Amino acid sequence: SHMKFGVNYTPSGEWFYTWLNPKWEVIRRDLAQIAELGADHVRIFPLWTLLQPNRTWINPKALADVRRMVELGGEAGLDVYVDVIQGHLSSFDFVPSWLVSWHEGSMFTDQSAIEAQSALTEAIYGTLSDMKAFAGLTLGNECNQFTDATHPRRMPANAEQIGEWLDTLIGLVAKRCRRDGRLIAHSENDAIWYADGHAFLPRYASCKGDVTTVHSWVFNGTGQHYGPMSCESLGHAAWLVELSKAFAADPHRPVWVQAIGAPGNVIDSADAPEFCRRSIDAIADCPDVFGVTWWCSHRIPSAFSDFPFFEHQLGLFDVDGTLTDVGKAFRDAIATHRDTVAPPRTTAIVIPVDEQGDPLMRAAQAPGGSLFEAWANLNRQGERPCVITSLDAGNPAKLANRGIVRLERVELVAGHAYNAVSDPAF
Amino acid sequence: SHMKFGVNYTPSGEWFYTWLNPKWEVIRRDLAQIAELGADHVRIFPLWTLLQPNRTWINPKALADVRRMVELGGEAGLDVYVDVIQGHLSSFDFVPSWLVSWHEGSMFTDQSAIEAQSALTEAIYGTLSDMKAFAGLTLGNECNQFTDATHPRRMPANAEQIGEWLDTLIGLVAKRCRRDGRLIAHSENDAIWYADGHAFLPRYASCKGDVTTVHSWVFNGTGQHYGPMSCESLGHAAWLVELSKAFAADPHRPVWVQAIGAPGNVIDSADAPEFCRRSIDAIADCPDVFGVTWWCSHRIPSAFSDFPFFEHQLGLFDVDGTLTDVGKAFRDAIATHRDTVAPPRTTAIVIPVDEQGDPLMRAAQAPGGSLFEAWANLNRQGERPCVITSLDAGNPAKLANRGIVRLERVELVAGHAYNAV
Ligand SMILES: CC(=O)N[C@@H]1[C@@H](O)[C@H](O)[C@@H](CO)O[C@H]1O
Numbered sequence: 001s002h003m004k005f006g007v008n009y010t011p012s013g014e015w016f017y018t019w020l021n022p023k024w025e026v027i028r029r030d031l032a033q034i035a036e037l038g039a040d041h042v043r044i045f046p047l048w049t050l051l052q053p054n055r056t057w058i059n060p061k062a063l064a065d066v067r068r069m070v071e072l073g074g075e076a077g078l079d080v081y082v083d084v085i086q087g088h089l090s091s092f093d094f095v096p097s098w099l100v101s102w103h104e105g106s107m108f109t110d111q112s113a114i115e116a117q118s119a120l121t122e123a124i125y126g127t128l129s130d131m132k133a134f135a136g137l138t139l140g141n142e143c144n145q146f147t148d149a150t151h152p153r154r155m156p157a158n159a160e161q162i163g164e165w166l167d168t169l170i171g172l173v174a175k176r177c178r179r180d181g182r183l184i185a186h187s188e189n190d191a192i193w194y195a196d197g198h199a200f201l202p203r204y205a206s207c208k209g210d211v212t213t214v215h216s217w218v219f220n221g222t223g224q225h226y227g228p229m230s231c232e233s234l235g236h237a238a239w240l241v242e243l244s245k246a247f248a249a250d251p252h253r254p255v256w257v258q259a260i261g262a263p264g265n266v267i268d269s270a271d272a273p274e275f276c277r278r279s280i281d282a283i284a285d286c287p288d289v290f291g292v293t294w295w296c297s298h299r300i301p302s303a304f305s306d307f308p309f310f311e312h313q314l315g316l317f318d319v320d321g322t323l324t325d326v327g328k329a330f331r332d333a334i335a336t337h338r339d340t341v342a343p344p345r346t347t348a349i350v351i352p353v354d355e356q357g358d359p360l361m362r363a364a365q366a367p368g369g370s371l372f373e374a375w376a377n378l379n380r381q382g383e384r385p386c387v388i389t390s391l392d393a394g395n396p397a398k399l400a401n402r403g404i405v406r407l408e409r410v411e412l413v414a415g416h417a418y419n420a421v422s423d424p425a426f
Numbered sequence: 427s428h429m430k431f432g433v434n435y436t437p438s439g440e441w442f443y444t445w446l447n448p449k450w451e452v453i454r455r456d457l458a459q460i461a462e463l464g465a466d467h468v469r470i471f472p473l474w475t476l477l478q479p480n481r482t483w484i485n486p487k488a489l490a491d492v493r494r495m496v497e498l499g500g501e502a503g504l505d506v507y508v509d510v511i512q513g514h515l516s517s518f519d520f521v522p523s524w525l526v527s528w529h530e531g532s533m534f535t536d537q538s539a540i541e542a543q544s545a546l547t548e549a550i551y552g553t554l555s556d557m558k559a560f561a562g563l564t565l566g567n568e569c570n571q572f573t574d575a576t577h578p579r580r581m582p583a584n585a586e587q588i589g590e591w592l593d594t595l596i597g598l599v600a601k602r603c604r605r606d607g608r609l610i611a612h613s614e615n616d617a618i619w620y621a622d623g624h625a626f627l628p629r630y631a632s633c634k635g636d637v638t639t640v641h642s643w644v645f646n647g648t649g650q651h652y653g654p655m656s657c658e659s660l661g662h663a664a665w666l667v668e669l670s671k672a673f674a675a676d677p678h679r680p681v682w683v684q685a686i687g688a689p690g691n692v693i694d695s696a697d698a699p700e701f702c703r704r705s706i707d708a709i710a711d712c713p714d715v716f717g718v719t720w721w722c723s724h725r726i727p728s729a730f731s732d733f734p735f736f737e738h739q740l741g742l743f744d745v746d747g748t749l750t751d752v753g754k755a756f757r758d759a760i761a762t763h764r765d766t767v768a769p770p771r772t773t774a775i776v777i778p779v780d781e782q783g784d785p786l787m788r789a790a791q792a793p794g795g796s797l798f799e800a801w802a803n804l805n806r807q808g809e810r811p812c813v814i815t816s817l818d819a820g821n822p823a824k825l826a827n828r829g830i831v832r833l834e835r836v837e838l839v840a841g842h843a844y845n846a847v
């Protein structure tokens with residue numbers, strides 16, 4: 001099992017505002033730059049407001065521009081994954097006018113909105129279905145943030161409705177994807193792992209869609225509470241990988257670290273290269289990792305305002321296309337880990353779950369929680385821990401299937417370090 | 427004093443979603459159709475989300491597309507008025523990501539947002555300043571709806587802050603407009619005239635900017651309470667014209683009926699042509715009317731969803747491009763009233779106001795109110811009433827300046843018909 005290595009593509013010069021009038025020669029250079037790092041894929045992000053400005057009209061020009069960006073990715077030698085619904089990017093919401101204010105509604109429970117997102121998922125897949133470089137689709141970037149209790153314009157949903165939303169949209173394309181050789185996934189931020197009462201449940205990420213996605217951001221309280229270059233912080237992405245597997249029905253389901261960056265609000269810019277290198281060392285020591293997709297390709301121009309300041313500095317390339325120090329670190333990490341194979345992990349911490357396989361207390365596996373710290377401490381001691389649920393602890397078939405020979409039990413104690421946002425202003 | 431006649435331009439085929447990828451040959455045909463009616467101007471509506479996707483970046487392609495649309499209006503023989511901030515159109519809000527949810531803010535009070543709207547106003551004027559067909563700008567369509575308490579995502583402001591917002595944005599371009607021969611205006615929905623407690627005040631519409639704008643929509647309770655083809659309904663636009671003048675410092679300031687339609691949620695479709703004709707008859711008998719701008723040019727395609735159903739039928743041309751019966755009525759109204767000059771109105775009903783010139787009770791001038799009905803009843807009787815405030819009533823200079831020789835005082839009685847949506 002060998003990891004893919006890719007980059008989340010932020011267009012240079014105009015960011016995602018480039019979709020209004022893409023500068024195709026710049027986008028061509030951007031993607032060639034990414035390929036020259038040794039990346040094998042990119043993840044790209046069209047805007048929902050431009051794709052679907054009316055509930056029952058999808059803009060053909062927006063679809064054609066997505067196709068053109070995929071085409072240029074292929075011409076650079078990259079596989080291209082497309083996120084369908086943004087939705088949310090870098091602290092900003094892009095919600096079409098037919099779901100705001102006078103037309104406020106929940107994308108998760110309004111049947112007419114669900115039908116619209118279904119039409120959009122089918123239109124994106126159908127537009128791209130003939131492209132050799134089109135590698136797969138994700139429903140959208142961290143869509144669960146819209147339903148969290150923290151959201152200022154929350155779209156309500158209970159957990160059963162979220163399950164139906166995922167099943168509906170994934171089920172539109174899952175059969176096509178498997179027959180065509182493409183991937184279908186969905187993406188939640190870490191509230192799915194950490195926030196008690198959150199309507200997206202851990203098993204949804206680990207059982208629905210073809211691969212589990214995790215987005216690893218140590219500004220979530222981990223870097224603040226333990227230190228930016230602590231083992232808890234450097235190992236955070238590996239923790240999410242191993243945590244997610246506890247909730248998977250498939251004992252070797254791949255886990256995609258679909259976004260990870262070195263955020264300057266907690267990690268000193270001089271440490272970001274080492275953070276990159278050592279975070280990927282830790283990821284590479286987890287079996288069945290689908291790939292690592294760094295956030296992000298290009299710095300945000302300083303002309304653009306209201307981003308959390310660190311978001312500007314996340315790029316592997318600066319605004320002119322020059323490689324940054326983190327870019328150099330990621331390039332070297334790809335070369336280092338192209339054929340790293342991780343050995344099985346055989347000591348498991350046990351997460352108490354209910355009869356449906358859901359955590360009794362997600363706060364216990366959040367930064368500062370008893371389960372979070374049990375894993376981190378076994379990790380620091382060199383024991384390479386994995387994670388199972390209490391239900392599977394009594395299932396020798398799955399245990400033997402994963403090669404687990406030792407169990408570690410701890411009680412639930414909530415952590416209080418978790419940050420649901422990236423910046424104090426939110 | 428002669429009226430201009432124009433149309434609010436809704437692009438055929440794709441509505442304002444056309445701004446994503448304008449079909450310029452279709453837009454050229456749209457504007458040629460409008461000119462063939464005998465219209466002399468159009469009002470057009472760029473989208474804020476496309477113009478200013480970041481607080482400190484205005485999209486040059488969006489500016490250039492506005493310029494191209496103005497150019498084609500001129501080539502069709504039309505003057506083009508541009509609304510800067512949409513903002514709000516036909517029940518939908520278009521608010522950039524940097525002012526919503528995690529970035530929620532008030533366009534009326536957040537200084538950084540005010541500076542962004544200032545940059546956008548200057549960029550629109552500067553982009554269009556060399557265009558012969560560019561006739562003027564309005565800050566945006568019914569922007570006050572964002573601060574109304576009825577709005578589900580309200581942008582708060584008190585009346586003093588609204589006044590400063592207007593003064594700030596208008597003052598950016600007012601001198602340039604006067605020097606270049608163009609107009610600067612702002613636009614509120616009728617909450618400014620009717621909604622007690624609303625932070626936009628009547629005198630703002632009648633004193634700030636170069637001309638008063640009124641948008642006349644009888645689904646506001648007038649048609650429901652009196653009947654869609656009652657004199658109260660047919661005269662509602664003329665009423666807004668004459669009511670607005672009471673709060674104007676300038677005794678001959680022009681009043682622009684900048685939007686008026688025959689909404690099918692209260693007016694039977696078979697009656698809409700007569701509603702058009704007779705509403706304009708009443709408007710044409712008010713002096714100092716800048717113009718009448720019908721809502722709207724082209725019907726919204728039935729493929730588009732979530733509009734109030736009546737919005738689909740407001741266009742003068744059908745989805746196939748054929749002239750509707752209301753379009754024929756508007757075309758004939760232009761021919762009828764191109765050279766109508768309204769004589770002075772000399773009998774005034776008096777609006778009690780406080781020392782700042784604000785109504786003591788806006789509900790009394792709202793549908794169902796005593797002042798609203800006193801005007802409609804005098805107009806129905808052929809008395810051609812105008813409107814002054816109680817402050818005016820003890821100012822012989824202004825009274826003489828407007829030619830007012832008779833006053834009618836009426837006791838305040840609140841109306842209850844007003845619909846804010
Ligand atoms: C409002 C806010 O800051 N949201 C951020 C989001 O932009 C980011 O993608 C995510 C990563 O986990 O973390 C959230 O807290």
Ligand SMILES: CC(=O)N[C@@H]1[C@@H](O)[C@H](O)[C@@H](CO)O[C@H]1O
Nearest residue numbers: 102516517615616641643846847
């Ligand atoms: C939410 C809603 O219906 N808003 C409408 C607005 O679209 C219309 O332009 C205006 C005309 O006066 O009346 C408001 O009530």
Ligand code: NA
Nearest residue numbers: 354358359360
């Ligand atoms: Na529960």
